Design a protein around this ligand. Structure first.
Ligand SMILES: COC(=O)C1(NCC(=O)Nc2nnc(C)s2)CC(C)(C)OC(C)(C)C1
Length: 127
């Protein structure tokens, strides 16, 4: 079975705004998670063809990854910070859904989620 197209990352017809929270999500949150030693499985869409995971997109119907999130932030695809936070949570929960408690990849995602939560804790007041 085939991979789906990646999630939409750019829509020129959407209204655009810069906020302190969106800037922080790109320059601090995404940046920190991206450079983490456990980031690599999450830096691009899961390639189920290359990885021989034929059931991945039978199970995961809302794919999300940090490559997509980076693109959405840098193309001003998000209007509300919560949209971006939701995408990070989708990425983590997808990993938990496809895999099982205690799997190495799950432990990796858990660590990244903990780091994410520490970084989101210091999200600036929308100002
Ligand atoms: C865990 O990830 C991986 O690196 C591996 N593939 C499965 C996979 O990618 N699962 C994902 N679940 N959520 C993601 C986001 S990635 C794991 C094993 C099976 C040990 O060996 C290969 C080489 C195929 C790489």
């Amino acid at each position: 079975s085939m991979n789906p197209p990646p999630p939409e990352t750019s829509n020129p017809n959407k209204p655009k705004r810069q906020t302190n929270q969106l800037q922080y999500l790109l320059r601090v949150v995404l940046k920190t998670l991206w450079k983490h030693q456990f980031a690599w499985p999450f830096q691009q869409p899961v390639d189920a063809v290359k990885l021989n995971l034929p059931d991945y997109y039978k199970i995961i119907k809302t794919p999300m990854d940090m490559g997509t999130i980076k693109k959405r932030l840098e193309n001003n695809y998000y209007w509300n910070a919560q949209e971006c936070i939701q995408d990070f949570n989708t990425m983590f929960t997808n990993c938990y859904i496809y895999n099982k408690p205690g799997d190495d990849i799950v432990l990796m995602a858990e660590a990244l989620e903990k780091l994410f939560l520490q970084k989101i804790n210091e999200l600036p007041t929308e100002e």
